[model samples]
Target: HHVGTNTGGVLVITDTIIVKSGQTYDGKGIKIIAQGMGDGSQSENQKPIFKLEKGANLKNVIIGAPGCDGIHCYGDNVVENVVWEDVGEDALTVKSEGVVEVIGGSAKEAADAVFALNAPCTFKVKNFTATNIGKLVRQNGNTTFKVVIYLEDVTLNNVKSCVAKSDSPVSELWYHNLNVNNCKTLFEFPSQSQIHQY
Candidate 1:
């Protein structure tokens, strides 16, 4: 899958943007780069470029190189048409419990999980694409929590390991109209987890 181009210019950010509850922050295809953050490594202490509060929405943003920890979700939110040129720490993380819907986006060059789940929630992704990634979605290590995931009209290329992984056996994952290229494993979940594909 091909990623979208960001022609809205570039903006280097030194601090995280906090999207208030029920608010929407549209970047309008701007390529936002993070500064003063970790060097896109697997560190747990890195900060995110955007932090979304309850019912917040982020759209039309391009995360350029050194994207820090990408976006952080505190509650129910919607992320649409957000592209990640290079993932840092991860592309997005669910910090609290709520429904997070990602519609129309792409992420590339993820050294680790593109999506990390730290709390129980319903994560839905539609019309998404990923390339050169490791583990499309992963539940936080050693943390047993119920995470329900849904993927629709998604494409993945040059992936390492499985598409989604979870430590908890009670979590659920479902996908429809999913396509993959140069990938082997489909999912890595503990026994008793409900995983369905159609």
Candidate 2:
């Protein structure tokens, strides 16, 4: 699914999809506003303001009051200049062997600003800001317990926890140009997994 530039509506992408610049989506936080709008067929409860598929690209869009996640990507997606406001879940969630690069955006009032759950091996994020978030970054494991995440040029304000990892062995966790204020903890690693920060 491809919406032309400067359009307004739910953003739904197919397996091969791309979102042009200067678009806007307002879900109004209604129940399941973003559900059943994207690539995968889903129940009413699991939806997002924007749904991207594998190898998708989203650029220069704004989302407001997404009931669930503001943006959900399957894998290998490129998102740039996308802003989200008042999202319920994580602003962006990358599943499985998902690889994503976020060039710019500021997510506010989210449970987790960015989540890389079930990311067996690799996840990368850069040049993004988050405010008033429960947890800024969350990395959870699936079948494979080892995970590696790279965060660069990120800023956080009034966030509960900057990073939270559980049941996942972090191979290499790197944070460059990370700024946090009014945060409870900069990093939270489970007792079993050791901590590493740059």
Candidate 3:
């Protein structure tokens, strides 16, 4: 399925767009590009294009080149129909504890991970497509937090081995109806008990 058609004009953002708690920010298919930020490198200090607060919802947005840190979710949030033209650092990051749901979006050209889980949370990705990435999802290295990941109806292409990698033994991964092309390994975890595919 097609994502982020860019019905509106392009927007350049120099600072992060903070979506207030319990609010919804609909980009209306505008392509937003990050500027004056770290050069879309693997720098951990780069700012984000958008930051969603607790209960915030972001939809119909297209993240262009120099995506910075992409989107940061502080708490329970929903990201729908948001596309990343060229992923930076990572496509999205779970900055804190929350249930983050991504629906009907796609990402490409991520040098590292498409989704980076920095804290313990239930992260769900459904009907998403990704290509030319490193890992589809990666839990923060050496973090013992319990991260529950759910991926359904996802299409992946040109991904590295171990699509999902987690160092935390307590983390769990569940995937259903995943379509992959040119991927070597499906997932890698400290333990095999928590990896489930349906």
RMSD of each: 2.7, 6.9, 1.9
Compared with the true structure, the alpha-carbon lDDT of candidate 3 equals 0.90
- The residue pairs that clash in candidate 1, if any, are none
Q: List residue ranges in candidate 1 displaced over 4 A.
A: 1-6
lDDT per residue, candidate 2, 7-91, as tens digits?
Answer: 5555433222233333333223222234333322222244556666677677666655443545666677777767775656566
Per TM-score, the best of the predicted structures is 3
Q: What's the distance in Å from true for residue 107, model 3?
A: 0.1
Q: Which lDDT values do the candidates have, in the order given?
A: 0.90, 0.59, 0.90
Clash number for each model:
0, 0, 0
TM-scores for all predictions: 0.94, 0.71, 0.95
Q: Pick the winner on lDDT between candidates 2 and 3.
A: 3
Clashing pairs in 3: none
